[PDB]
Structure formats: C-alpha cells, structure tokens
Amino acid sequence: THSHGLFKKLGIPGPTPLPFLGNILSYHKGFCMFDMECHKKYGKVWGFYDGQQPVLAITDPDMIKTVLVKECYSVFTNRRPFGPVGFMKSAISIAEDEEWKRLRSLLSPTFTSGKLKEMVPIIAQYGDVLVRNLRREAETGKPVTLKDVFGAYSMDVITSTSFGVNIDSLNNPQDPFPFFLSITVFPFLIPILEVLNICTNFLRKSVKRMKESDFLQLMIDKALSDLELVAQSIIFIFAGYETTSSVLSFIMYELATHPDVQQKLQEEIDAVLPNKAPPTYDTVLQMEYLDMVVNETLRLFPIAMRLERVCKKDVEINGMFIPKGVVVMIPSYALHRDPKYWTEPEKFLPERFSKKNKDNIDPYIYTPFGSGPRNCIGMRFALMNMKLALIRVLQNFSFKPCKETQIPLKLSLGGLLQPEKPVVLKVESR
C-alpha cells in the first residue's frame, strides 16, 4: 500500500484503498455500478486503485478530448498492459507505440467505404441463413435464445468477410474461445506467466496454415509477418462475433419491451425496401430511425463500459497535473447514464438521436466506439453488419416478451457487459 497516497498528495478525491487490494472490493457490483456511484460521490474527477495501480477517472469533455485526440500520439498512446499474452502481444489492440502505429496504418484500408461496400453482397447471404434458421424455431412456438442464432450469424460473417470460409453455423463450428482478474492485484505475476507459455494451438497452426495457395488478401499484398497475420485475424475474430451478437440481443430486448419503436422501425424498413427488397450499402445508410435505435441501445449498453489510456510521462492537461504511469479512464457507461446530460437516462428513447436532437449530444460523452486515433477500427463494419442483420430479421419477424424473458434486464454484475439471464423472446412470422 506504499503507492496508495498518490491521489491524497495530488488532492484528488476517491474511495480509500485497502492495502494490496486497493479498491477492487468495490467491483462487487460490477464496473458500471462502481463508476456510476463514484461519478456521484466525487464529481468531475476522482481516482482509485486497481491493486497498486492508480486509475484516474475523468469526465470533463475537454479533458477527454485531450487524452483521446489531442495528446494521443504524444502521451496517451497505449492502453493498460494486459498479460500473459504470448505471441498475441503483436496484436493491434495490445501493441504499443511505434509497433501499434505501423499496425494501424497496415490494417486501416480494410474498413474503407469501398471495402465495406464490397462486403454487402457477401453479408446478404447469411442473413437468409439467419431468417431460415429462425423460421424453424418460429413455426414451432418455441422461444428463441437470441445470442445463439445471432452468434451463429455473427460467426458466419467474420469468417468470410476476412478469409472466405463458408459454414452454416448449426453443424460443427470450428471456433471455440474468474481468473482474468487477480492480474490487477498480481501484475507482478504477469511477467511470470510470460515465460511458461501460458498464453491452444488450434488456429495458431490452422489459421497459420492460411496457405490460400479481402483482409487476408490486403495483408500479404514496413512489412507484416504471417504470424503477425494470425494475431490480427484472432483480434478481428474476437470482435465480429461476441460484440455483434451481444448488441443484437440488446436491441431485440429493447424492441420487444418497447413495441411502439419496433413497429415504427418496421415501417421504415418496408419503405426504403419495398416488397422486402434486399438491403444494399446505400439503402442501409438512408434509414435514420434504424441508426437511432442502434445508437440509443449502444448508449444504454456500451459493451466496453470503459475507455483507458496509459499516461506515459508527466503532463498537465486542461489545468490538472497527471503523473507518469497513471491509467486515465473514461467511464463510458456512467457518462451514457449521467442525468446531467440525458433526460430520463434509464429510459430507452431513440428520439435522443433524431436530427432535431442529435445536436444536443457531446461526442466525448457518448463514446460507444472510443475516440481519436485509437478508436474502434471496426466501427463502420460493425454498424453495417448489425444493421444488415436487423433489416432482414425485422422484415420477416416480430418479437414479443415471453414468460421467461428477464424484465427488467439485469446487467452482468461480473466483468463484461452482458445480461445475467440470456435474452429469450417469442418470434412470430409476418
């Protein structure tokens, strides 16, 4: 508990840290409730300890703009060190400084407006596998676990949008994937596990055997290793499955508990796409209410909850001294629910993002995809992927609450932003 006097010195409020543990016992209600409580207890700026690690929480939109944008390349370049990783240290999400800058430029032309438009005719296939897999569980009046049929779709998308492998995700899906804590109170142990190779060889040799003799194309086309190829593929595999399915489950819960929004969305889909027209790249972007629903759900459920940057050297941002080594954190979940910015923040209201009202929204308060040079590189792909899925599903089915549907939806009091009970809804055919 030696370094537990930093914020007392700097005159920054926060919860009193216990020795060794710091303030980690306060995570018993989850990161979200802890951040929402501290945002009320200490105001605009406070600090806590993840073990011996000082973490300063900031809410000033100017100070957030400074960290994420103005001083990204200079001071706030990297996220919190995460280990043990092994060869995955070369992943773009985990790499640091110059190595990250080289990876960012190398992987950036994957999600251009042109490369995304090339994927719309490809994504349109598994949307029909998604509907037909749902039409079976709908003609039988059997409630549907959404994350299963969504994850089956989300897995089909990422394997082909990046590589080209086509699999109906109801036969054998070759893609499998607590203790993830303790690292906080035992980071000294991270370099320890850095050597006993505790990092499966499943795609470590299978994806490594991407002989191919797309994102896989533009890579072999400084330079990039074939393993540097494996680690990035795993990263792009991580997001496009779990994030895509979890948000789509979050959307259908809110569309089920708010039937008025679900119908108003179905009316717009039939308008832009008459006769159940196939969704194209440009017709998806025309739908504004679909964008408002996705934006409002991501406000209530920012699947990242927090944004983090490591302060690599002493700085004085927006009139506040911040010492080297301190982790700067932006409580995305708490800011998305801050009543000082959102009227009735717990209520699902897509009209916050109407073009009449989308101007009263600060882009450093609503940050579902981060901000600055190190934002979510797969943002445009993710939004398009989820929107292409919502259109084809709502064009065919309507969703109603079931007997076993968790109303209201508890968030996972544990680590990652998921529901406690899975989202099960009744599916009816139009």
Ligand X SMILES: O=C(N[C@H](CS[C@@H](Cc1ccccc1)C(=O)NCCCc1cccnc1)Cc1cccc2ccccc12)c1cccnc1
313: contact with a copy of itself by CB under 8 A: yes
Residue pair 78/309 in contact (Cβ under 8 Å)? The answer is yes
The contacts of residue 363 (CB under 8 Å, 6+ apart) are: 371
Residue 413 lies near a copy of itself (rule: CB under 8 A): no
Length of the chain: 430
Look at residue 175 and give the partner it binds from ligand HEM, a copy of itself, ligand X, none, a contact being a CB closer than 5 to 8 Å depending on partner kind: none
The side-by-side arrangement of strands in the sheet containing 424-429 is 144-145, 424-429, 397-401
Q: How far is the CB of 382 from ligand X (least distance, A)?
A: 8
Kindly state whether residue 50 participates in binding ligand X, applying the rule CB under 6 A: no
Q: How many CA atoms lie less than 13 Å away from 57 in the CB half-sphere?
A: 28
Residue 321 found at the interface with a copy of itself (CB under 8 A)? no
- Least Å from the CB of residue 221 to ligand HEM: 18
| Phi and psi, residue 171, nearest 5° | -100, -160
Is residue 256 a contact residue for ligand X (CB under 6 A)? no
d(CA 168, CA 158): 13
- Look up residue 355 and give its two tokens: 């073009």
- Binds 82, which of ligand HEM, ligand X, a copy of itself, none (CB < 5 to 8 A, cut-off by type)? ligand X
Minimum Å distance from CB 110 to ligand HEM? Answer: 8
Binds ligand X (CB under 6 A): choice among 232, 243, 395, 396: 243
172 CB-near residues (< 8 Å, 6+ apart): none
Residues contacting 159, CB < 8 A, separation 6+: 165, 166, 167, 175, 237
CB of 107 to ligand HEM, least distance (A): 7
Which of ligand X, ligand HEM, a copy of itself, none sits in contact with 416, Cβ below 5 to 8 A by type? ligand X
Among 23, 26, 52, 160, binds a copy of itself (CB under 8 A): 52
Q: Which is nearer to ligand X, 35 or 242 (CB)?
A: 242
Residue 199 labelled as part of a binding site: no
3-class SS of residue 81: coil
Residues within the interface to ligand X (CB under 6 A): 79, 82, 85, 88, 91, 93-94, 235, 238-239, 242-243, 304, 376, 416
